[PDB]
Write a protein that binds this ligand. Sequence first.
Ligand SMILES: *[C@@H]1O[C@H](CO)[C@@H](O[C@@H]2O[C@H](CO)[C@@H](O[C@@H]3O[C@H](CO)[C@@H](O)[C@H](O[C@H]4O[C@H](CO)[C@@H](O)[C@H](O)[C@@H]4O)[C@@H]3O)[C@H](O)[C@H]2NC(C)=O)[C@H](O)[C@H]1NC(C)=O
Ligand SMILES: *[C@@H]1O[C@H](CO)[C@@H](O[C@@H]2O[C@H](CO)[C@@H](O[C@@H]3O[C@H](CO)[C@@H](O)[C@H](O[C@H]4O[C@H](CO)[C@@H](O)[C@H](O)[C@@H]4O)[C@@H]3O)[C@H](O)[C@H]2NC(C)=O)[C@H](O)[C@H]1NC(C)=O
Ligand SMILES: *[C@@H]1O[C@H](CO)[C@@H](O[C@@H]2O[C@H](CO)[C@@H](O)[C@H](O)[C@H]2NC(C)=O)[C@H](O)[C@H]1NC(C)=O
Ligand SMILES: *[C@@H]1O[C@H](CO)[C@@H](O[C@@H]2O[C@H](CO)[C@@H](O)[C@H](O)[C@H]2NC(C)=O)[C@H](O)[C@H]1NC(C)=O
Ligand SMILES: *[C@@H]1O[C@H](CO)[C@@H](O[C@@H]2O[C@H](CO)[C@@H](O)[C@H](O)[C@H]2NC(C)=O)[C@H](O)[C@H]1NC(C)=O
Ligand SMILES: *[C@@H]1O[C@H](CO)[C@@H](O[C@@H]2O[C@H](CO)[C@@H](O)[C@H](O)[C@H]2NC(C)=O)[C@H](O)[C@H]1NC(C)=O
Ligand SMILES: O=C(O)CC[C@H](CP(=O)(O)Cc1ccc(I)cc1)C(=O)O
Ligand SMILES: O=C(O)CC[C@H](CP(=O)(O)Cc1ccc(I)cc1)C(=O)O
Ligand SMILES: *[C@@H]1O[C@H](CO)[C@@H](O)[C@H](O)[C@H]1NC(C)=O
Ligand SMILES: *[C@@H]1O[C@H](CO)[C@@H](O)[C@H](O)[C@H]1NC(C)=O
Ligand SMILES: *[C@@H]1O[C@H](CO)[C@@H](O)[C@H](O)[C@H]1NC(C)=O
Ligand SMILES: *[C@@H]1O[C@H](CO)[C@@H](O)[C@H](O)[C@H]1NC(C)=O
Ligand SMILES: *[C@@H]1O[C@H](CO)[C@@H](O)[C@H](O)[C@H]1NC(C)=O
Ligand SMILES: *[C@@H]1O[C@H](CO)[C@@H](O)[C@H](O)[C@H]1NC(C)=O
Ligand SMILES: *[C@@H]1O[C@H](CO)[C@@H](O)[C@H](O)[C@H]1NC(C)=O
Ligand SMILES: *[C@@H]1O[C@H](CO)[C@@H](O)[C@H](O)[C@H]1NC(C)=O
Ligand SMILES: [Ca+2]
Ligand SMILES: [Ca+2]
Ligand SMILES: [Cl-]
Ligand SMILES: [Cl-]
Ligand SMILES: [Zn+2]
Ligand SMILES: [Zn+2]
Ligand SMILES: [Zn+2]
Ligand SMILES: [Zn+2]
Lengths: 682, 682
Amino acid sequence: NMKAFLDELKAENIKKFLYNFTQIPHLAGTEQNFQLAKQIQSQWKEFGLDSVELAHYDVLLSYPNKTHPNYISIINEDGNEIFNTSLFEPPPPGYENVSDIVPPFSAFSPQGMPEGDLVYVNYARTEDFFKLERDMKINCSGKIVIARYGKVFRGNKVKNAQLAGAKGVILYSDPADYFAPGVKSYPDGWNLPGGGVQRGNILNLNGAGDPLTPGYPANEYAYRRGIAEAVGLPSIPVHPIGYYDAQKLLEKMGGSAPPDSSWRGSLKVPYNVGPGFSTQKVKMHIHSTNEVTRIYNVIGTLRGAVEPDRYVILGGHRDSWVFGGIDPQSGAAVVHEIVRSFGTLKKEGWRPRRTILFASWDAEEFGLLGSTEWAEENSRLLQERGVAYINADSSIEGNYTLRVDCTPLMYSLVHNLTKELKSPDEGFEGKSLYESWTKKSPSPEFSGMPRISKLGSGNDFEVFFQRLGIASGRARYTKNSGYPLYHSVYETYELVEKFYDPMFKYHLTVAQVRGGMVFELANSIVLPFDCRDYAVVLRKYADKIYSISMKHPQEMKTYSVSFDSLFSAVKNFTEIASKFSERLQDFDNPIVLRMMNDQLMFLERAFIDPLGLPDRPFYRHVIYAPSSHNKYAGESFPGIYDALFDIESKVDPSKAWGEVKRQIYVAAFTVQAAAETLSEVA
Amino acid sequence: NMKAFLDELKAENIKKFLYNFTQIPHLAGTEQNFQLAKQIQSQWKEFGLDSVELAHYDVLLSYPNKTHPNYISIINEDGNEIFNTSLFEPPPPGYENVSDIVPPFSAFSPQGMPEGDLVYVNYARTEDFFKLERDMKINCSGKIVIARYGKVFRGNKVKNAQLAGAKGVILYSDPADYFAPGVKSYPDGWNLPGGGVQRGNILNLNGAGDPLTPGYPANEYAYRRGIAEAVGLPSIPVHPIGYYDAQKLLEKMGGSAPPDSSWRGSLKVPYNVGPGFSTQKVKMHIHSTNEVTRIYNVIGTLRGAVEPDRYVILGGHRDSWVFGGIDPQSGAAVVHEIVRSFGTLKKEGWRPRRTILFASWDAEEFGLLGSTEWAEENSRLLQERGVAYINADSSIEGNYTLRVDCTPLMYSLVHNLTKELKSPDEGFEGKSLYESWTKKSPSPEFSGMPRISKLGSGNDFEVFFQRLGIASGRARYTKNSGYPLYHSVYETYELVEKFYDPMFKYHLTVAQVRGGMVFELANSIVLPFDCRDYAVVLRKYADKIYSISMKHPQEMKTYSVSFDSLFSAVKNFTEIASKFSERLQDFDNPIVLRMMNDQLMFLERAFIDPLGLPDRPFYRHVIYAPSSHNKYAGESFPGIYDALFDIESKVDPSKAWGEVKRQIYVAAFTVQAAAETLSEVA
Ligand SMILES: *[C@@H]1O[C@H](CO)[C@@H](O[C@@H]2O[C@H](CO)[C@@H](O[C@@H]3O[C@H](CO)[C@@H](O)[C@H](O[C@H]4O[C@H](CO)[C@@H](O)[C@H](O)[C@@H]4O)[C@@H]3O)[C@H](O)[C@H]2NC(C)=O)[C@H](O)[C@H]1NC(C)=O
Ligand SMILES: *[C@@H]1O[C@H](CO)[C@@H](O[C@@H]2O[C@H](CO)[C@@H](O[C@@H]3O[C@H](CO)[C@@H](O)[C@H](O[C@H]4O[C@H](CO)[C@@H](O)[C@H](O)[C@@H]4O)[C@@H]3O)[C@H](O)[C@H]2NC(C)=O)[C@H](O)[C@H]1NC(C)=O
Ligand SMILES: *[C@@H]1O[C@H](CO)[C@@H](O[C@@H]2O[C@H](CO)[C@@H](O)[C@H](O)[C@H]2NC(C)=O)[C@H](O)[C@H]1NC(C)=O
Ligand SMILES: *[C@@H]1O[C@H](CO)[C@@H](O[C@@H]2O[C@H](CO)[C@@H](O)[C@H](O)[C@H]2NC(C)=O)[C@H](O)[C@H]1NC(C)=O
Ligand SMILES: *[C@@H]1O[C@H](CO)[C@@H](O[C@@H]2O[C@H](CO)[C@@H](O)[C@H](O)[C@H]2NC(C)=O)[C@H](O)[C@H]1NC(C)=O
Ligand SMILES: *[C@@H]1O[C@H](CO)[C@@H](O[C@@H]2O[C@H](CO)[C@@H](O)[C@H](O)[C@H]2NC(C)=O)[C@H](O)[C@H]1NC(C)=O
Ligand SMILES: O=C(O)CC[C@H](CP(=O)(O)Cc1ccc(I)cc1)C(=O)O
Ligand SMILES: O=C(O)CC[C@H](CP(=O)(O)Cc1ccc(I)cc1)C(=O)O
Ligand SMILES: *[C@@H]1O[C@H](CO)[C@@H](O)[C@H](O)[C@H]1NC(C)=O
Ligand SMILES: *[C@@H]1O[C@H](CO)[C@@H](O)[C@H](O)[C@H]1NC(C)=O
Ligand SMILES: *[C@@H]1O[C@H](CO)[C@@H](O)[C@H](O)[C@H]1NC(C)=O
Ligand SMILES: *[C@@H]1O[C@H](CO)[C@@H](O)[C@H](O)[C@H]1NC(C)=O
Ligand SMILES: *[C@@H]1O[C@H](CO)[C@@H](O)[C@H](O)[C@H]1NC(C)=O
Ligand SMILES: *[C@@H]1O[C@H](CO)[C@@H](O)[C@H](O)[C@H]1NC(C)=O
Ligand SMILES: *[C@@H]1O[C@H](CO)[C@@H](O)[C@H](O)[C@H]1NC(C)=O
Ligand SMILES: *[C@@H]1O[C@H](CO)[C@@H](O)[C@H](O)[C@H]1NC(C)=O
Ligand SMILES: [Ca+2]
Ligand SMILES: [Ca+2]
Ligand SMILES: [Cl-]
Ligand SMILES: [Cl-]
Ligand SMILES: [Zn+2]
Ligand SMILES: [Zn+2]
Ligand SMILES: [Zn+2]
Ligand SMILES: [Zn+2]
């Protein structure tokens, strides 16, 4: 039973897998990551799973030229390079003889050597640019922008810069965002040194997966787009730097002063916006290449005893920018011990009711490529058989409390499960995870319950949830800016053991939460989804988008913009979902059981519109999508939200409001249609 | 049991329903068709079905202006109308006091009064135009074209004319295509009189349904496209005429002579191609309007006893251009008696295993609007629950032999069923339908078996099969040019009773074929689909498209165009489908049964690509689509076919061949993926 599963998980095992996964870099497309995949495949076979396979794809990746390093320069009038940025990060103690630490670089930057004047754009958010162009009347065209990391996904920053006319982007880590007060730099604390740099891709894929093969798996016979038709690639060069290098670039900044304090970091510089310094310019040198490279997912199967054609999936990535001490090996080590523990019951003669699939995804760091291509290959099986997807990237971002993001269909399952688990928090010994989680992170929606956020993107659940409509969830420990050492060489096992989780108790709790969700999904007779929870949030989301529109009362009058159809649909959903729940509590018959479970499994599916959202065909869920301004954040009724965004600035109001009304219709229709899936079937 | 069902069907009942359905016109959007829908709904309730509902939609229809008739004129230099075409068809005997016979018109023609010189374009097929432009070097730009009806759907003719620069189209019925030798004109035989005209829509919808609401049902709150963004509407005026009127227009034709005999009809005219006569011109007067009008489908439910969440659908249209004696009431009367007969067993305490839905669709004549909108509304239920769709338009086109078009998944079911039925054919008394059907219509694919054709479009199965991937089939009696009186006022009950089927025995046989297919689908424990039949045709289709490409050996060398991946996939499908069939013959367990039946139900589904075919998003089946040159005809591997079509004429070969190779990949992938749905599930 579940307790047997849960008691078998050990903090010590997790510790030792983490150690094992973090001694050398495991960059996607490298032989080191192929050999770690082969290791995981033998171990999962030894641990007891029925079959364990590699699935490979040939996808577009990006790497620096080893003989031709990327860097940025201040040049004087004569064209002399008077300051050059660092070529690599100072390695941490004990790691100086490690080969193949990829130098800091922005994956998928095009090649180039632009020189120009700098403008400073704060976080390069959509609103940052509005301020610059609209309020300050600064023009970024033909300028190189420098922007600090933080707040939004880096790909969005680059997209906004490109839209604004920039010809280069420089990203840096500001100590105000990546240096927590009162703690030391690595290795004596967990802060980012002035020499540390954040690697990361800067694509704008919008769910496409491999840039060359949107819609279709990048297998051996795949037809590939030419690079100039590739999806999501940036057209201006980009590179990241540490804050010692950044101070040199910013210290000379002239032109206009920062519009306000929100624009100032914590370096000793004026944070002037530019443009320009006075005869000195900036010059970038980027020589990275894009190359089609083979990647490898590991797929493990534990066959269900009763419904082997019903799939519960636990997945997370294995590739890392360098050592991956938190991101992702802290998640991967937890998956490994969950597989061990399931395989232990299996060996005692137990099987789950439903089939469980376990995945170690490749190339997540380069745009969720491994998960996406596998799902493109297997989409028919997933869509008619996929019960749920539980993600398993990093178990920790912090040591304060639990963080859960999921579909409303799982809200009750998580509430129940966390009441059965003990808190590991200091001061809550003998109290439940639910109790500590809800004191420390209370819902702002109401009640004596914990906050649960919306799924956005930036992780491997995206294809499952936003493209295919499979109920998905994730959980990890978090802090009270992500963590300072994110994607730097300094993110090591030692960082985790010394400063995050010395006793591996937080890891163990996250392993219990993830493992328990999976166990219930795979073995409970009736699926543990509550459709009434979707009815409640649909109403809150409708109220919200309604409020946004009501900022424009005159336009709503002129163009007759009614939300009545959406509210009607949400009422209908609320009433039908109540009746189904009654029927759920009132039946005996396995065909009936299977019919009702199918109704539950398909309800997430019902929110998918096969035409997709406007200009984003692979985002097909009508209720949720990644924010168009920040891939990491979820937005509700995305179609209507984006139609209303900045609408006072469009030239043809009647066309713009026409499209608002069209999206209201699409939403109202899709809510009604989803509701009807829960009606009596004949 | 089945025999009980089949014995309950009566030829006499069919006769009397036909009579009842054909005494007044039932044009879509008219009150007469609404009242026939209300009648059908009460009767189906009385006949015993569990529930019977109307589903309504507000869709774009088209009607002539009652105070401003459409016509064509020869005008002299002074602008005098020296000849005018007929304003209505001479009514048949006994029908002269019937109100509301819509005059001959091309539904959805735009308004206009173009005058110009005539070019004669034969059937206005794609190859007709190639001949004119390429061989004969005639330019149709700014000309009015006149084309005879036949060979291809009329919408295609209009699309080709429009592409060729025409500014008007005149369609006529040539006696060579609509006057069978040795038989008299109505009312003394079944031929078309010189005064008869073929009504019909001329849209190019490509599966969109209602022109204003592609993707979404045209319900009460629907957001509608403006007419200028409407899908599928023609941009040049169009009108049809009889052959007495046509002779007047053709008799004066000058310019170039017909390129060959295939271009000559059976009128006493030279069939000169034009352009022009000599100072006389042609002038059209079209004043028809498009209007959003409510339509009504009748939906009947007979709940399944064991799997009520599995839907077998029998459907056909009810709307007619005028009386609808063959098209569609000859089908509708057969559905009515099938419903009576099922409801009779129901009343004796019987239920089918699976739910049966019965539909009387509206507005089929105006572009399959009623079926399409209902499926757009219910697409989630259909896609996860839809076992099969059996269409039921006209039961007869002729009195010679059976004609069946269906997915290969039903080939065995139809072979078996027709061996259990008696032939009604003269000279085959005491022999089986299978025997008569296969002597008279032998497969050209090989064997001592009957011909079964591919599904194309031009009927209500299109949304079910090509958009949603639900296994579909149809059957009717046919002739050894469709039937002469198609869509004219002369298509009456009397036509059927006197000349087609005096004893209603052909009707009864078609009722047995349709009814029996439905009965087996709804009640058999294991679904009566044979996946090995799909493996055999996939190989034939691959050979075929391969042969087409091999007309271009040099290009295949230069661009490296290999079909190896498609042949590999078809081999894989063949082998996996064999194993599944073995497993199908070897299991006991209802979850197992339900899993295997789901694998069978989903196999048609697997051929759907959610991105659709190029430039046709609502045609999503990769194996079949309506021919791009003739909506009535099915084409196999449509994506590759169209990429190869006329490819020697494209300007950039490497791009054109690139796209061939892309479609080979898409096909090969989709066959492999469909195959994998029939693999062991874990
Ligand atoms: C939520 O569920 C409810 C059912 O509980 C569902 O209610 C439906 O609302 C529609 C309106 O959107 C009703 O439609 C009416 O049907 C009758 C039938 O004759 C017509 O009389 C009405 O049309 C008249 O009025 C119209 C107003 O302009 C005219 O245009 C029209 O020509 C007629 O004069 C109208 O069609 C429908 O009957 C109910 N269904 C019920 C209660 O059976 C509601 O739509 C659901 N919400 C959503 C978003 O789906
Ligand atoms: C029909 O089903 C069969 C299985 O019965 C399936 O066979 C598969 O074919 C692919 C080739 O398309 C095989 O792929 C190989 O896998 C090995 C693993 O290391 C590689 O060595 C091969 O790659 C080498 O050669 C390549 C050639 O260019 C190089 O590019 C590459 O870098 C390597 O040098 C290749 O990937 C695959 O293993 C089999 N599967 C089996 C038998 O397990 C076939 O593809 C199916 N047909 C379709 C259309 O799906
Ligand atoms: C991580 O753990 C694994 C397995 O416990 C180690 O891999 C094994 O290494 C030994 C000795 O080199 C070999 O004999 C085995 O074949 C390996 N087993 C495999 C690949 O499953 C591995 O060396 C550990 N890595 C580190 C850095 O400690
Ligand atoms: C979470 O737990 C609660 C309490 O056990 C469950 O709610 C009960 O479910 C049982 C079993 O069907 C009912 O008899 C009770 O009436 C329910 N109490 C309620 C409605 O508060 C709930 O089902 C659980 N949710 C899951 C497992 O998803
Ligand atoms: C077609 O058949 C139907 C039903 O047998 C006839 O409709 C009925 O007509 C009678 C007399 O007018 C009414 O009392 C009933 O209410 C009708 N029943 C219905 C609508 O179900 C109908 O008149 C026949 N039509 C023709 C042209 O013969
Ligand atoms: C059509 O009928 C044939 C002959 O009855 C069926 O083929 C047999 O099916 C039975 C039942 O499973 C097997 O035991 C035999 O070996 C089959 N004979 C063969 C393969 O020729 C066939 O299943 C029927 N097809 C249907 C119902 O779709
Ligand atoms: O291409 C993407 O969508 C995101 C790629 C990658 C995903 P990640 O694995 O690093 C996200 C992440 C960040 C912090 C933590 I703790 C866990 C996961 C990123 O650069 O954001
Ligand atoms: O819009 C369409 O796709 C077709 C509409 C209509 C369909 P139909 O019902 O008349 C097709 C048809 C023709 C002959 C016969 I016998 C049965 C059915 C047509 O004009 O072709
Ligand atoms: C690295 O840079 C130089 C100059 O082109 C050369 O060694 C080689 O071309 C580069 N490697 C690449 C582009 O893969
Ligand atoms: C920057 O690097 C370039 C290229 O190696 C070199 O010419 C220049 O002197 C360097 N500048 C400094 C200040 O080291
Ligand atoms: C930004 O400057 C460029 C330089 O030519 C100009 O063309 C562009 O329109 C400017 N942005 C504004 C003010 O529209
Ligand atoms: C771990 O827990 C303590 C207790 O609040 C906290 O102060 C410390 O900063 C935490 N570690 C990290 C890296 O957040
Ligand atoms: C029919 O034609 C005339 C002229 O416009 C007039 O009676 C009326 O406008 C027309 N009806 C329409 C366009 O619906
Ligand atoms: C054709 O009809 C028009 C409009 O009614 C009329 O002016 C003309 O005389 C008619 N021609 C003939 C030959 O009847
Ligand atoms: C057909 O004639 C028109 C009339 O201007 C011309 O422009 C067009 O190009 C012609 N077709 C050919 C020969 O391309
Ligand atoms: C009905 O059957 C006879 C026998 O062959 C045939 O000659 C006759 O033309 C048929 N009727 C029609 C309308 O085809
Ligand atoms: Ca792909
Ligand atoms: Ca529609
Ligand atoms: Cl996660
Ligand atoms: Cl039919
Ligand atoms: Zn990462
Ligand atoms: Zn990660
Ligand atoms: Zn018709
Ligand atoms: Zn018809």
